[PDB]
Amino acid sequence: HMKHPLMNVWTLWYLENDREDMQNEITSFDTVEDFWSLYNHIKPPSEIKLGSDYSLFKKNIRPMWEDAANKQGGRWVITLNKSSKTDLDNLWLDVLLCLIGEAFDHSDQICGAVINIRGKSNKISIWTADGNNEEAALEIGHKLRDALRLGRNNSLQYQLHKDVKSIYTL
């Protein structure tokens, strides 16, 4: 009954690889308890089919970089040199808790997060609104590196959606 409200409304998406039509809107939530109600009953990233994606974006922002909300932005990309069940699920969940918990000073610049299950490599990305906002992108990047305890097995790179060169590397 007495749920903890989130600062923003969030929507979970699931892309299933096949021949926009495959992006599927799962559900939306605006409290901590409603988030856990969702996460506790769905497959972790380590269990979804090869070629699928999970995405968590603020309500009415689609996980598509060409949309107006994302067109001028970029993404912090996390790569795993050696992938494992543990790192995939822990990193994705920790990323979701950073987003819904508003762990960044530049909250307004966060659009959402995407995890790509691509077999031998896997990517987790945090999409921001403006790739030219140097202060916000770096503040979010430093927070990710610390909150996720990224290290030798990881690389933290900021890339413009329009671009493959990187703007920043942590």
Binding site: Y14, V32, S37, I42
Partner: protein, 46 residues
């Protein structure tokens, strides 16, 4: 759970709606967090 000064809590509805990782995970086990949600797609259900 424990709440920081200025943070939103049932005792402090005016507080900032910002939550730490540890606080969020502590709420994972409450009764409201264990209810099954309504979802459109099934393939992501175990």
């Amino acid at each position: 759970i424990n709440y920081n000064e200025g943070q939103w809590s049932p005792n402090n509805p005016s507080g900032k709606k910002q939550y730490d990782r540890e606080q969020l995970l502590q709420l994972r086990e409450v009764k409201a967090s264990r209810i099954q949600p309504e979802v459109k797609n099934v393939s992501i259900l175990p």
